[PDB]
Amino acid sequence: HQCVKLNDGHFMPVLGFGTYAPPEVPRSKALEVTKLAIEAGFRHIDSAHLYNNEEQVGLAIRSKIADGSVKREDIFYTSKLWSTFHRPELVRPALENSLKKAQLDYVDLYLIHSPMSLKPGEELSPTDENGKVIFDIVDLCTTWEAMEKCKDAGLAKSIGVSNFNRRQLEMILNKPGLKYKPVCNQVECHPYFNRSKLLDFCKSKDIVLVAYSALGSQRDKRWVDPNSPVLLEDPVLCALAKKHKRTPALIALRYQLQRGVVVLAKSYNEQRIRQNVQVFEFQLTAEDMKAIDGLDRNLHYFNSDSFASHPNYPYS
């Protein structure tokens, strides 16, 4: 049920449904599970141009509105501007295309998906002849201006950013003539990577931190090393799970909720979708919180340093 108030005065449900699934998973699944998530109780839905599921996720949302389960106002829908669209003249059409695909009139949240700008083209990841990705140099404040223009048009209720470090946040915040600061920063966050001081910064700036891969990434081989720890097998999460008679995933999600973090949870399994909303049913003790805090190992699951050269690369 619970929402947080955004600095532009809109309200974001603190539990969101992540919709990304690898190209293998048939697109029809995005429709089914998103309806399941809405039936379960999720009211915040996270998607992006990159995910290649906006049509199906939007269709699920329209279906739940049309069968009378919720109203458009109950749903908080996020899309993300992909990095090949950072040039300002590309921002508004990318949003309009996302809206045409999803068949909604606005998104509640439009994010700059990443700070690392890419070469403009109808290619999602443009490669040169050696197969390496071609970067673009774009002053992200101009991107932000085009985002603000989308807000004024009513195409996006709120606007924010994703995968931005402290300096990139402040570069947007110091911007001359800034009309709107980001309501949120959506970054990887979980017990192995808590973002304690990035979160503290954000709290100071009235910017929500939004956790993704908060259950530990889907452990895709293309992006994640198999030798990495599996977050849900962690001894302390498993112990706390058995103590509260919950699951390690529920522990992780509740952990974020009690540090004032809005948390996403991907699941394409009906049981787990309906289990994840139980995060509102129990509390962790202050000592449980301390013990989960103790797991912080500054661990990225997404191996990104193949892009270390990028001037806007966030882990510089």
Ligand SMILES: NC(=O)c1ccc[n+]([C@@H]2O[C@H](COP(=O)([O-])OP(=O)(O)OC[C@H]3O[C@@H](n4cnc5c(N)ncnc54)[C@H](OP(=O)(O)O)[C@@H]3O)[C@@H](O)[C@H]2O)c1
């Ligand atoms: N801004 C960004 O750059 C960025 C990057 C990555 C992701 N995201 C967003 O964040 C969302 C979630 O992050 P994510 O895709 O990395 O996955 P995640 O939320 O970390 O979930 C990881 C895996 O945990 C499993 N799981 C879910 N609920 C469970 C439960 N109750 N018990 C045990 N296992 C459970 C799921 O598998 P099953 O499907 O089998 O349940 C899922 O594949 C994405 O879907 C996407 O919308 C954003």
Ligand SMILES: Cc1ccc(NC(=O)c2cc3cccc(O)c3oc2=N)cc1
């Ligand atoms: C130069 C450059 C620009 C952008 C990126 N980023 C990614 O590859 C992403 C992968 C991804 C994967 C799953 C879900 C997401 O939400 C994702 O979001 C991403 N931004 C990397 C390098």
